[PDB]
């Protein structure tokens, strides 16, 4: 999985208020050239929609799980046929659910302290949530003391400071509403927008 | 003997002899259908002589050949933009940025069609991005 966020370098944290919305958006986001999908649990029967979506895993997509709060949710994710999943805090329940499931983990860190809870638990690449409070100045800090760690921040990640947070050495990105709001022609415009975008980014 | 009359298509075309380097570039893809340098070549003629329905169906019979080439999707994006398809040129200049993210033209022109077409945002978005590439 790790190979995958260095190699498209931007997922799509996909929130939606149905299974109608979810799919249609995520399907605009793949065609855009976005091939990492993060579908939330906000939506509803949000295993529904990454079980729905398996036909893309063909094509060459990797749908996975956003918003993991609870174990209970975490099966209905793996059972749907979830490729990796993502939680904005860190749990120790999921981490050691996921570990012995075989499935990829990323969970939500903030402090230096919540990093080396997540460490300990053999995490080396974290979601840093929200990267719209710690700023990219917080993974610089962290290169020093912890350098074999990687990150994906997610939430305050534009096409204005996607440079910015690259230049820190992030691993790939999380962008929300600024890829996924919009209709099918907006949301496939603007994942082309920001591939190129970070496409600029990593030169 | 493909090579040749494209050559000579393209000699009649530095001498501004446009519509007989038309007729040279539809000699040699009647030798090789295949020749995506005549078909290119064909339609950037005819968008000159302002054929443009018909530069875009050579532009399309080139791409069809040579899928990844920018400046082809490009060049459909700025025919397709002089007929007025808007949404057709969006997608083709989008194709264009998607093959080669570092046309700093193809990102001014997708910024141009899109706010012709309304989306201010995504036009915003295109411009920004022709404007990083382009320092002038």
Redesign the interface.
Same mark, same amino acid.
């Given at each position: 999985m790790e190979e995958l966020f260095k190699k498209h370098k931007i997922v799509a944290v996909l929130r939606a208020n149905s299974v109608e919305e979810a799919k249609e958006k995520a399907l605009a986001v793949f065609r855009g050239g976005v091939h990492l999908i993060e579908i939330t649990f906000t939506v509803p029967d949000a295993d529904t929609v990454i079980k729905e979506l398996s036909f893309l895993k063909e094509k060459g997509a990797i749908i996975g799980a956003g918003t993991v709060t609870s174990l209970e949710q975490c099966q209905k994710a793996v059972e749907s046929g979830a490729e990796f999943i993502v939680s904005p805090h860190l749990d120790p329940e999921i981490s050691k659910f996921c570990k012995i499931n075989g499935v990829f983990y990323m969970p939500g860190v903030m402090t230096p302290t919540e990093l080396v809870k997540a460490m300990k638990l053999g995490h080396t690449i974290l979601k840093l949530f929200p990267g719209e409070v710690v700023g990219p100045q917080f993974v610089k800090a962290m290169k020093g003391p912890f350098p074999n760690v990687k990150f994906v921040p997610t939430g305050g990640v534009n096409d204005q400071n996607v440079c910015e947070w690259f230049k820190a050495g992030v691993l790939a990105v999380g962008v929300g509403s600024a890829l996924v709001k919009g209709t099918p022609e907006q949301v496939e415009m603007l994942a082309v927008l920001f591939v190129a975008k970070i496409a600029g980014c990593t030169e | 003997m493909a090579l040749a009359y494209v050559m000579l298509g393209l000699l009649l075309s530095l001498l501004n002899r446009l519509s007989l380097a038309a007729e040279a570039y539809k000699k040699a893809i009647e030798l090789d259908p295949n020749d995506a340098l005549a078909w290119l070549l064909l339609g950037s003629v005819l968008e000159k002589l302002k054929r443009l329905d018909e530069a875009a169906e050579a532009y399309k019979k080139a791409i069809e050949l040579k899928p990844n080439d920018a400046s082809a999707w490009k060049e459909l994006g700025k025919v397709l933009e002089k007929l007025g398809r808007l949404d057709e040129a969006?997608k083709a200049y #989008?194709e264009a940025?998607?093959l080669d993210?570092?046309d700093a033209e193809a #990102?001014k022109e997708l910024g141009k069609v $899109?706010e012709k077409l309304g989306?201010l945002? $995504?036009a915003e978005? #295109?411009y920004? $991005?022709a404007i990083? $590439?382009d320092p002038n």
């Open positions: - | 969006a #989008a940025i998607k993210p570092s #990102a $899109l989306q945002e $995504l978005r #295109a920004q $991005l990083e $590439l």
